[PDB]
Nucleic acid binder design. Structure first.
Lengths: 157, 157
DNA sequence: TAAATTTAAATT
DNA sequence: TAAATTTAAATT
């Protein structure tokens, strides 16, 4: 039967489970940080006033790695995509990741595509839409699998 | 003081008045037609079920003419722009206008830019956004003037 | 330089 | 081939 999530951010975790199960993926790491205060910005905080968070997840599937970036938009402010970064370097990810967090706040909660294209090129700056209906916090058991399917599409170029 | 409109379509008429007054424009013609049934389409009718209408308005300002196209989206389905066509030919407008009505329904209430660019080129296929806040059917007396100002911008290239 | 709203190409 | 939803560049 269908799924019911507390927030948008909860659904992103159920996706990781499905990737582990149906799509044979391994989670390398999982870290969640707060978006930084950049300039006179206000969107680095949620409507209620708490720090807005972003979760990065390293993944491994069939001898190839990618990073998943997901922004906390559970307050309904903005509908961003799930970013799929291919070509990340352990030796500089922490710095690249920090620059990404800054750019997201600069562009008012919007992926810095100019930077991402700079970093990983047109074919390395990928992303996947959230499943229709998540605005209602309900997703069918098959829509959740399609979320994973559509992710493998971007990975398979 | 501010304006209150019954529907989105009512505001487009108040714009024409302001263009006559503050921006020295003359209304050449005013016709409103129903969008056609194209294929197995349903958007040529409003939510309540009545025929969806489109109003064309020929305008003259400082020895130069342009056509204004406005689609009836008072049922809240879609938020389209006000099209500003420059380079229209009396000898073929009726046919061009008909093709435009078809394309709008083909693309599911969306301006056929490919056609419009075909017809009037990049510099002749212009448009202007509706004033922020019209979703609430309330517009400030200065926002209505800005609607006309921003229209003259496109006309002045 | 920030956010907020309108628009439209995309996709699902 | 239609509509419906998600996304994002634009603009105001």
């Amino acid at each position: 039967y269908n799924h019911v999530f507390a927030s948008r951010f909860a659904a992103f975790n159920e996706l990781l489970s499905i990737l582990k199960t149906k799509f044979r993926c391994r989670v390398i790491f999982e870290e969640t940080l707060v978006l930084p205060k950049v300039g006179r910005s206000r969107l680095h905080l949620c409507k209620d006033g708490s720090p807005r968070v972003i979760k990065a997840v390293g993944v491994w599937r069939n001898a190839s790695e990618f990073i998943l970036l997901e922004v906390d938009a559970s307050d309904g402010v903005k509908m961003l995509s799930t970013k799929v970064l291919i070509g990340v370097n352990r030796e500089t990810w922490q710095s690249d990741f920090e620059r990404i967090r800054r750019g997201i706040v600069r562009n008012s909660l919007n992926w810095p595509n100019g930077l991402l294209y700079q970093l990983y090129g047109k074919e390395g700056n990928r992303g996947v839409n959230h499943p229709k209906g998540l605005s209602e916090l309900e997703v069918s058991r098959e829509d959740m699998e399609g979320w994973g399917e559509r992710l493998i599409r971007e990975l398979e170029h």
